Design a protein around this ligand. Structure first.
Ligand SMILES: Nc1c(N2CCN(C3CCCCC3)CC2)cc(Nc2ccc(C(=O)O)cc2)c2c1C(=O)c1ccccc1C2=O
Ligand SMILES: Nc1c(N2CCN(C3CCCCC3)CC2)cc(Nc2ccc(C(=O)O)cc2)c2c1C(=O)c1ccccc1C2=O
Lengths: 258, 272
C-alpha cells in the first residue's frame, strides 16, 4: 500500500541533482507526519514504488510514498543532507576540501572509527536484504546516502563491472553472494576515500583482472583485519565467500576499540 | 583526403578498452611505413557518415601533440580507425595511477611510481597547451578538452587524443565555462577555460572538478562564478595561470599562446 501525497503539501525549494530518470529536488512537505524537508524524485514506476513501500529498514533510505496528482510523477524520500556516500568520502579524504556540512562532520579524513561505522551501516542494510532473499545487483558508494550525524543508508536499487564478481561478469549470475562481493568492493571504496575500483585500468582491462583473479590493492589507510574482510568477500567461488551476517558482525566488533 | 589501409595488413593482438566509439585494440599493421604497433578503433553501429567526416578532420589535423592518425579501413566490418599506440593510455587514469597513495600497475621503468616532479607536471601541461595552440591557430574548437581525452606515450609524451563526466546531447559541464552552459557558446576562449580545468586535473592527479558536488550543484557553482580550490600540489604561479583561464568574461581570459609560453617558461625553471 503506497502512501499517496497531495501536491499542495509538496513545495519545491531547489534542485539537488539529476539521476538516471530525472531531477531530484529538496522540498518542504506539510502534513506528512509538522512541515519538514524531504527529497523528491521526478519523471511502470508503480512496480518500483510498491517495492520501496515493501523494503523498510534503519539503513535503507526512508521512502515516504508518491504523488500522482498532476504530472510529473513524484517519489518522496527523506532528505539525506550530505548526499551520496561516494562524493562524501571524496570530500573528506587526503587532499580534499569540504564545501558544506563541516559543523556536522569535521573537515578532513574520517579516521578508523567513523569509516568502520560507515561500513557497518551499509552491511546492516545488506543483512536485511539477504534476509528477504533480495539481490541488489548494484551495491556501490554512489548508491548510498549520508544524513545528519553520519548515518548511512542504502539509497538506490535501479553495467557496473568493476563492482561485480567473475560469475556476474561472465555469466550474468547475480545472487546474495555477488552482492557480498560488491560489498567487499564498497569496503575498498570507503577505505580509499572513494576511488574507483581499478582506477588505473580501462573497463576491458579491469574485466580481465577480475576474471583472472587479481585482487584490488590494500588501501594505505587499511588495517590488515579490514583488508581480510574484503578478501573474505572476494573468494573466486561464491559458496566460499563470507556471509553478509558474518561480515556485519566482524565490522561491528572492530568499530568498538578499532 | 583519407589514407585507406587493407584489412589483411591489420592484425588484432588484444583489446585495450571500450569507448563510446566501439572497442579499441592493440594491433600490428604492415605496409604503413618502412610491421609496427598501432591502436585500432572499431566502430560499433548511419554512423557511416559520422565516420567519413571524422576521418577527414583527423587527416587534416597533423601536429606533434595530436595523436598520429594513420587512416581508416573500410573493407570488411567493423569500420576501423588506425592511430599510433600511446603505451600509458589516457592521461586521467595515468595521473590517478601516479597519485600520492595510488599504485602503479605498469610502465614504472618509464615513469617512476609516485607523484611526478613539478617539472614533469609542467611538461605534461605545456604539451597539451601546444596541441591547443595548434588548434586555435586553425580557428578550431575542441569542445571537450579534458585529461580523459589526452593520451600519454613512451617517455611521458602527451598528445590531444580524442576530439559521470557528462550531463544529459551530452555536455561535459564540469569542464565548461558559463557561456557554454548558459548559451551553448563554444569558442577558443571556452577551450582556454577547459584548458584551465585540465591544469587543475594535472595538479590534482586526476580528481574530478567539483568532485564534492552533483552535476546540478556544479553548474550552479560555475554559473555563479565560483573557482576550483587550489590543489595542495599547486605553486601560486601555476594556480595563477588557472585563474587566468577562468575569467567569467571570455574576452578577459589568457590566450592559449600566453598560457603555453608561460608554462614552457615554468617547465624550464620550475618554482619552489
Ligand atoms: N542530498 C542529496 C544530494 N545532494 C545534496 C547534498 N549536496 C551537498 C552535500 C554537502 C556538500 C556538497 C553539497 C550533495 C548533493 C543529491 C542527490 N542526488 C544526486 C547526487 C549525485 C549526483 C551525481 O553524481 O551527479 C546526482 C544526483 C540526492 C540527495 C538526497 O538526499 C536524496 C535522498 C533520497 C533519494 C535521493 C536523493 C538524491 O538523489
Ligand atoms: N594505450 C591505450 C590504453 N591503455 C593501454 C594500457 N593500459 C594501462 C595498463 C595499466 C597501467 C599503464 C597503462 C592503459 C590503457 C587505452 C586506450 N583506450 C581506452 C582508455 C580507457 C578506457 C576506459 O576508461 O574504459 C577505454 C579505452 C587507448 C590506448 C591508446 O594507446 C590509444 C591510442 C590511440 C587512440 C586511442 C587509444 C586508446 O583508446
Amino acid at each position: 500500500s503506497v502512501h499517496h501525497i497531495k501536491r499542495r503539501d509538496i513545495v519545491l525549494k531547489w534542485e539537488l541533482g539529476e539521476g538516471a530518470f530525472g531531477k531530484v529536488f529538496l522540498a518542504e512537505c506539510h502534513n506528512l507526519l509538522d512541515k519538514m524537508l524531504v527529497a523528491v524524485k521526478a519523471l511502470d514506476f508503480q512496480r518500483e514504488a510498491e517495492l520501496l513501500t515493501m523494503l523498510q529498514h534503519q539503513h535503507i533510505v526512508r521512502f515516504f510514498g508518491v504523488c500522482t496528482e498532476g504530472r510529473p510523477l513524484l517519489m518522496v524520500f527523506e532528505y539525506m543532507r550530505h548526499g551520496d556516500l561516494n562524493r562524501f568520502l571524496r570530500s573528506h579524504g587526503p587532499d580534499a576540501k569540504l564545501l558544506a556540512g563541516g559543523e556536522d562532520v569535521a573537515p578532513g579524513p574520517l579516521g578508523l572509527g567513523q569509516l568502520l561505522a560507515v561500513a557497518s551501516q551499509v552491511a546492516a542494510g545488506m543483512v536485511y536484504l539477504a534476509g528477504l532473499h533480495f539481490v541488489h545487483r548494484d551495491l556501490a558508494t554512489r548508491n548510498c546516502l549520508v544524513g545528519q550525524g553520519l548515518v548511512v543508508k542504502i539509497g538506490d536499487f535501479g553495467l557496473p563491472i568493476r563492482w561485480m564478481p567473475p560469475e556476474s561478469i561472465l555469466y550474468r549470475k547475480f545472487t546474495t553472494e555477488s552482492d557480498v562481493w560488491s560489498f567487499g568492493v564498497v569496503l575498498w571504496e570507503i577505505f580509499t576515500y572513494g576511488k574507483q575500483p581499478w582506477y588505473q585500468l580501462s573497463n576491458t582491462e579491469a574485466i580481465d583482472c577480475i576474471t583472472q583473479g587479481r585482487e584490488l590493492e590494500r588501501p594505505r589507510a587499511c588495517p590488515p583485519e579490514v583488508y581480510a574482510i574484503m578478501r573474505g568477500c572476494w573468494q573466486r567461488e561464491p559458496q566460499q565467500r563470507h556471509s553478509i551476517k558474518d561480515v556485519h558482525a566482524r565490522l561491528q566488533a572492530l568499530a568498538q576499540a578499532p
